[PDB]
Amino acid sequence: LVIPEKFQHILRVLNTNIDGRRKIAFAITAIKGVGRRYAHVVLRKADIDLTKRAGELTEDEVERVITIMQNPRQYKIPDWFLNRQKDVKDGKYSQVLANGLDNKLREDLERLKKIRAHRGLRHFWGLRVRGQHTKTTGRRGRT
Amino acid sequence: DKLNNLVLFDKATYDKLCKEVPNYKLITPAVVSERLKIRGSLARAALQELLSKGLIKLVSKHRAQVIYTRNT
Amino acid sequence: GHQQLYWSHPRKFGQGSRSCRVCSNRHGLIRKYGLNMCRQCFRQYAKDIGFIKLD
Amino acid sequence: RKFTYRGVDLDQLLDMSYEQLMQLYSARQRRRLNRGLRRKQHSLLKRLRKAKKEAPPMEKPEVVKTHLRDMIILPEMVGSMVGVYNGKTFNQVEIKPEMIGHYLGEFSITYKPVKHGRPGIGAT
RNA sequence: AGCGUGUGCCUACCCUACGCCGGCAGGCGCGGGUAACCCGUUGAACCCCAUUCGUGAUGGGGAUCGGGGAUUGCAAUUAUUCCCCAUGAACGAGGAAUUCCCAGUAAGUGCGGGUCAUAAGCUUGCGUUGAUUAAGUCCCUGCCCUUUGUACACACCGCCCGU
Ligand SMILES: [Mg+2]
Ligand SMILES: [Mg+2]
Ligand SMILES: [Mg+2]
Ligand SMILES: [Mg+2]
Ligand SMILES: [Mg+2]
Ligand SMILES: [Mg+2]
Ligand SMILES: [Mg+2]
Ligand SMILES: [Mg+2]
Ligand SMILES: [Mg+2]
Ligand SMILES: [Mg+2]
Ligand SMILES: [Mg+2]
Ligand SMILES: [Mg+2]
Ligand SMILES: [Mg+2]
Ligand SMILES: [Mg+2]
Ligand SMILES: [Zn+2]
């Protein structure tokens, strides 16, 4: 129960800071694009015990987790689990992560804006997008 | 203020647990967590280890509450 | 021609496919037990139908 | 730089049949195509093809007007001028290759964006 | 657990057991019920017993958005509804003011009926767990009586005086 001599209080994974005091399953959800389900299935695929903290892992385990996370399709992770199934531009299934997600959302908004679809116009104006009523709600953030 | 509790035992805290906890007359993961600046999970693990070693009696076990006591 | 266009819109479901059997009104319709009456006509004819107020 | 729809460029899209295009589309478009198109959509497609055939080699085709706001933009429509009814006026839209899979009604807005005035006496 | 519904003049639209396929929404077969007969011994939810977390806007909360899949429809875009990954906002018990309630009651928790091609954050009912406080008063609010005053009777939202 004593802390190991080599313990990582802070980890640097994918330009993200991971708190080594949290359990490994929930520690890696700090990466944008990874949730509880995806983190749990990745760790179950890596054959890593879920009863240890993030800082207790060795470098081999960390790099294995990163490699499995980058390429889910290689490690029998199903397509329906992925969050970027059937890309519009290239048609490839994948899981998009911290910065890639940030620019992929930007490209998805730019596509709608340039083509002048109604949803893109709503995004440009700053209004609701999924057909909600705006008369009485959503006042916060407006003058 | 913020409450920063240890998640893994240190030398001083492990010595405190091994020396003073078995004499508290009322041992509870919340009590050990509050006195030793420890998280609840580490306190539960330490109390289970002490119970396994036989240094502490168990009075009642429940999911909400576990109660320990010093040996007679 | 006109024969095709007139009344062409399908009316197999919805409020436009049902009406009261007494006054031909489409609002407040009662379909339970196949009554097919609006609430006002039902309140007018309840005693004749056989519905009694006990509570 | 070259346009590709899910890894397929425009020429192959034009060569593909409807069954091949069903797998490229999304669930709603696939279901719509599986249920089939009716007479009016075929008439609109025929009119668009007729208009595009008669265009001069360097000029745009003549605008074809329609009320069909639920028509799915097929790859054969790219490069045609369609006036879409919005309830009051026919708005002119040129089909771009990036419009494949959307409806026509998404590109002719049905309301005027709100610019607010001073609130009246009845507001508290 | 309990109250109930279920294949319809026009009228298209019922409740579903069992086997297989799919990870899920679902899809295929093949049967029962016009009903104390079938769904159904209605294996409901809170609740109970264990596991993990540990005062951190946190594994609390789930708003807003991206990408996919499926069902109802003639038609789903201004997202019908449903499913899966991802994103993860305010909110740490709420000012002046104000509502309802006296026992199987208040509150917690689910389930039926109405609307219903698609369908409940509403309503109308049903159970399950189950209390604190009180057996008084006219202080507030309101409404009744009796006495009393009136120049009011379109009845104080009245009548009426002087610049
Ligand atoms: Mg995350
Ligand atoms: Mg809406
Ligand atoms: Mg608003
Ligand atoms: Mg959070
Ligand atoms: Mg959270
Ligand atoms: Mg979508
Ligand atoms: Mg509208
Ligand atoms: Mg989620
Ligand atoms: Mg209800
Ligand atoms: Mg219903
Ligand atoms: Mg209502
Ligand atoms: Mg009083
Ligand atoms: Mg007097
Ligand atoms: Mg008098
Ligand atoms: Zn009637």
From Swiss-Prot, chain A:
Disulphide linkage map: none
Chief site of localization: cytoplasm
Subcellular compartments: Cytoplasm
Cross-link named Glycyl lysine isopeptide (Lys-Gly) (interchain with G-Cter in SUMO2), sites: 89, 92, 104
Any one GO molecular function term: RNA binding
UniProt keyword annotations, A-Z: Acetylation, Cytoplasm, Isopeptide bond, Ribonucleoprotein, Ribosomal protein, RNA-binding, rRNA-binding, Ubl conjugation
GO biological process terms held by the UniProt record: cytoplasmic translation; translation
Modification N6-acetyllysine, positions: 92, 104
GO CC annotation: cytoplasm; cytosol; cytosolic ribosome; cytosolic small ribosomal subunit; extracellular exosome; focal adhesion; membrane; nucleoplasm
Family recorded in the similarity comment: Belongs to the universal ribosomal protein uS13 family.
HAMAP family, per the entry: Ribosomal_uS13 (MF_01315)
Function (record text): Component of the small ribosomal subunit. The ribosome is a large ribonucleoprotein complex responsible for the synthesis of proteins in the cell.
Subunit structure: Component of the small ribosomal subunit.
Protein name in UniProt: Small ribosomal subunit protein uS13
Organism: Homo sapiens (Human)
From Swiss-Prot, chain B:
Signal peptide: none
Keywords: Acetylation, Cytoplasm, Ribonucleoprotein, Ribosomal protein
GO molecular function: RNA binding; structural constituent of ribosome
Residues found modified as N6-acetyllysine: 2, 11, 19, 25, 53
GO CC annotations, alphabetized: cytoplasm; cytosol; cytosolic ribosome; cytosolic small ribosomal subunit; extracellular exosome; nucleolus; nucleoplasm; nucleus
Keyword Ribonucleoprotein included in the entry's annotation: yes
Protein name: Small ribosomal subunit protein eS25
Organism of provenance: Homo sapiens (Human)
Part of the full-length chain shown: 42 to 113 of 125
Curated annotation (Swiss-Prot), chain C:
Cross-referenced InterPro entries: Ribosomal_uS14, Ribosomal_uS14_CS, RIbosomal_uS14_euk_arc, Ribosomal_uS14_sf
UniProt keyword ATP-binding present: no
GO cellular component, as recorded: cytoplasm; cytoplasmic side of rough endoplasmic reticulum membrane; cytosol; cytosolic small ribosomal subunit; extracellular exosome; focal adhesion; nucleoplasm; ribosome
N6-acetyllysine sites (modified residues): 47
GO BP field: cytoplasmic translation; translation
Modification sites for Omega-N-methylarginine: 11
Keyword annotations: Acetylation, Cytoplasm, Diamond-Blackfan anemia, Disease variant, Endoplasmic reticulum, Metal-binding, Methylation, Phosphoprotein, Ribonucleoprotein, Ribosomal protein, Zinc
Family stated for the protein in its record: Belongs to the universal ribosomal protein uS14 family.
Name of the protein: Small ribosomal subunit protein uS14
This protein's encoding gene: RPS29
Curated annotation (Swiss-Prot), chain D:
Cross-link (Glycyl lysine isopeptide (Lys-Gly) (interchain with G-Cter in SUMO2)): 96
Annotated InterPro entries: Ribosomal_uS19, Ribosomal_uS19_CS, Ribosomal_uS19_euk/arc, Ribosomal_uS19_SF
Keyword Ribonucleoprotein part of the UniProt annotation: yes
Alphabetical list of Gene3D superfamilies matching this protein: 30s Ribosomal Protein S19, Chain A (3.30.860.10)
Domain of life of the native organism: Eukaryota
Record-linked Pfam families: Ribosomal_S19 (PF00203)
Keyword check for Phosphoprotein: no
Subcellular location: Cytoplasm
Functional description taken from the UniProt entry: Component of the small ribosomal subunit. The ribosome is a large ribonucleoprotein complex responsible for the synthesis of proteins in the cell.
Family classification: Belongs to the universal ribosomal protein uS19 family.
Record-given protein name: Small ribosomal subunit protein uS19
Annotated organism of origin: Homo sapiens
